[PDB]
Design a protein around this nucleic acid. Structure first.
Ligand code: SF4
Ligand SMILES: [Ca+2]
Length: 352
DNA sequence: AAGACGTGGAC
DNA sequence: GTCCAGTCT
């Protein structure tokens, strides 16, 4: 970027930003903890989705120390529905490490902050630039689009060599007087103006510096790979009631939807049979199912569940063995369920 | 490294 | 219906 009028670019970008910057809950102050939380929540999740989750989370866990001391169950429930749930296990671990190793002070050194679980190259830039003024780039998906257009970067943005290129662009053009403002403005541009399709280039404060605008190829950029097809996964789910409460179980601490509660379920096309062999395997449990009541798909980034719900009734001769639990209906909202199984419940509840 | 890892705003 | 808003190791 040797012929790039960085100072004029910065002026124009940061004058636009002060006029148009959205009033968002995590912009109300620059507390390193609250900034960090918002930036974890914001990973692969849109601002408007995050807003109510951030507000509730901080009401519940208002300080790094208050989060570090909380039970893992209450932390997970606070994330219920947001997706990519290891973010919150990682953040939880990271705040405990900050509390013990760093005295409850978020490290302002990039290497030390990035060593915390959950903190990748985007989060280290976003948190340190915003809370501490550190001039680290905060290159997210939208920034990569903006910079690919401004500087006509025609390389696949998934490559490390492209990422290094974007990081180098940002270091050359950044306003070291206000790196947090500069980083937020590039993101904000990508969100309200330089959008994936039909960018509002005529409304764009940096149109004069944009090579893709000049050559007329904004919409061919950035260069990404088409997403491959994802495995579809037949999943039989059983909603069982003893009417004396409903049978649920907690998932594994590892892997998909770890530590979330679910209705008993089995992968397969004889769902009625496969589920009966499973539930009976448990201690003192006897079950008989009903005809299915609904079938629906639930998508993940890497696979797609094809859920088939089966209602049924239970008969326990005593305690229900871990990992299983009996829960009165009234008490289900207390547990953390994936969205797929939240739907399972709503479909079974209206089915009556 | 590749692939695992959730969900829905915005259109 | 399709895109796309990051980190693990
Ligand atoms: S002129 Fe258009 S393509 Fe270039 S930065 Fe602005 S909105 Fe994006
Ligand atoms: Ca890191």
């Amino acid at each position: 970027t040797e012929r790039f009028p960085a100072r004029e670019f910065q002026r124009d970008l940061l004058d636009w930003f002060a006029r148009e910057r959205r009033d968002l809950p995590w912009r109300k102050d620059r507390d390193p903890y609250k900034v960090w939380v918002s930036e974890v929540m914001l990973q692969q999740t849109r601002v408007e989705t995050v807003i109510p989750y951030f507000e509730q989370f901080i009401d519940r866990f208002p300080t790094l120390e208050a989060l570090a001391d909380a039970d893992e169950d209450e932390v997970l429930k606070a994330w219920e529905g947001l997706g990519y749930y290891s973010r919150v296990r990682n953040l939880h671990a990271a705040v405990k490490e900050v509390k013990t190793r760093y005295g409850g002070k978020v490290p302002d050194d990039p290497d030390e902050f990035s060593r915390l679980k959950g903190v990748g190259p985007y989060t280290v830039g976003a948190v340190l630039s915003l809370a501490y003024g550190v001039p680290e780039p905060a290159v997210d998906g939208s920034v990569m689009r903006v910079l690919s257009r401004l500087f006509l970067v025609t390389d696949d943005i998934a490559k490390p060599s492209t990422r290094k290129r974007f990081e180098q662009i940002v270091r050359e053009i950044m306003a070291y007087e206000n790196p947090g403002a500069f980083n937020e403005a590039l993101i904000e541009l990508g969100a309200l103006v330089c959008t994936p399709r039909r960018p509002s280039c005529l409304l764009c404060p940096v149109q004069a510096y944009c090579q893709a605008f000049a050559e007329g190829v904004a919409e061919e950029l950035p260069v990404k790979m088409k997403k491959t097809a994802v495995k579809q996964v037949p999943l039989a789910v059983a909603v069982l009631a003893d009417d004396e409460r409903v049978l649920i179980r907690k998932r594994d601490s590892t892997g998909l939807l770890a530590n979330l509660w679910e209705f008993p379920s089995c992968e397969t096309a004889d769902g009625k049979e496969k589920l009966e062999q499973m539930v009976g395997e448990q201690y003192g449990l006897q079950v008989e199912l009903t005809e299915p009541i609904v079938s629906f798909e639930h998508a993940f980034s890497h696979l797609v569940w094809q859920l088939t719900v089966f209602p049924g009734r239970l008969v326990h001769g005593g305690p229900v063995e871990e990992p299983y639990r009996l829960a009165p209906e009234d008490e289900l909202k207390a547990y953390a369920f994936p969205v797929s199984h939240q739907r399972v419940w709503r479909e079974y509840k209206e089915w009556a």
